[PDB]
Amino acid sequence: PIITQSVEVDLPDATESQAVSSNDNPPVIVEVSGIGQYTVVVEKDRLERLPPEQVVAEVSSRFKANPKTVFLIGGAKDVPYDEIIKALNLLHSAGVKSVGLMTQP
Amino acid sequence: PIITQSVEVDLPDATESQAVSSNDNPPVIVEVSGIGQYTVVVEKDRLERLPPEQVVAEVSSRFKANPKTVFLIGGAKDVPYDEIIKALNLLHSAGVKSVGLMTQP
Ligand code: NA
Ligand code: NA
Ligand code: NA
Ligand code: NA
Ligand code: NA
Ligand code: NA
């Protein structure tokens, strides 16, 4: 106590929906809720309860296979800010350069 | 019901602390807590309880005066994800291209 989190982001004019609609492949969705706990979803395939290092492995694998892959962070409206910063840092550590942020029911 | 929020972000290698430390001027901090309610802080000067359109006016004014200005979004660890997406969209609408995200006590 107390550790704070930070991340720098750039804001492009291109949109989250544009990224998804213009891509040949489904997006890879990193869903957050669970303190440092993630579900990775690609279409119907769900990889639940993954710890940070396993999310890095999964995401880095997909980015290497196709760097054009669209990555999204999904979560309920009330997911804590600190968890969102952690997730952005996690994705950047795995090599991801662009992310769509979206809230979900 | 139900409106969701989204924003696309790019992840540069440059950091939030780097942006602040390398700048000649203090950062402009948009603090969030309050549903669509913001405090804009520059050094000791606080502009509290600003509605979205007033934040846009204040931020756009500072960006026009100096486009090298460092903009930050500050908030407690538990600020809701949806409010963070709203704040990023608000800043981008005012012309801001880079933002540092940081949690605070
Ligand atoms: Na960063
Ligand atoms: Na793997
Ligand atoms: Na997280
Ligand atoms: Na966007
Ligand atoms: Na003004
Ligand atoms: Na907000």
Side-chain angles (χ1 to χ4, degrees), chain A residues 6-9 89 92, chain B residues 12-16:
Chain A
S6 61
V7 65
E8 185 76 9
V9 300
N89 279 320
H92 192 207
Chain B
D13 285 309
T15 74
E16 177 271 316

Side-chain angles (χ1 to χ4, degrees), chain B residues 32-38 79-80 82-88 90:
Chain B
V32 191
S33 213
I35 301 163
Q37 203 165 243
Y38 300 99
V79 171
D82 71 322
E83 299 291 337
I84 299 304
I85 294 175
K86 286 181 170 181
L88 286 165
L90 193 162

Side-chain angles (χ1 to χ4, degrees), chain A residues 2-17 19 70-85 88-89 91-92 96-105, chain B residues 2-17 19 70-85 88-89 91-92 96-105:
Chain A
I2 289 290
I3 315 182
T4 60
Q5 281 276 323
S6 61
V7 65
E8 185 76 9
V9 300
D10 291 336
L11 302 176
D13 285 309
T15 74
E16 177 271 316
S17 288
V70 173
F71 291 93
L72 306 175
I73 288 168
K77 287 188 174 317
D78 66 350
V79 171
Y81 189 20
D82 71 322
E83 299 291 337
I84 299 304
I85 294 175
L88 286 165
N89 279 320
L91 296 181
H92 192 207
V96 178
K97 297 178 168 199
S98 306
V99 183
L101 302 183
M102 62 181 191
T103 55
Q104 298 164 334
Chain B
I2 289 290
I3 315 182
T4 60
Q5 281 276 323
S6 61
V7 65
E8 185 76 9
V9 300
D10 291 336
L11 302 176
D13 285 309
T15 74
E16 177 271 316
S17 288
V70 173
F71 291 93
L72 306 175
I73 288 168
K77 287 188 174 317
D78 66 350
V79 171
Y81 189 20
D82 71 322
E83 299 291 337
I84 299 304
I85 294 175
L88 286 165
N89 279 320
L91 296 181
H92 192 207
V96 178
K97 297 178 168 199
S98 306
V99 183
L101 302 183
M102 62 181 191
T103 55
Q104 298 164 334

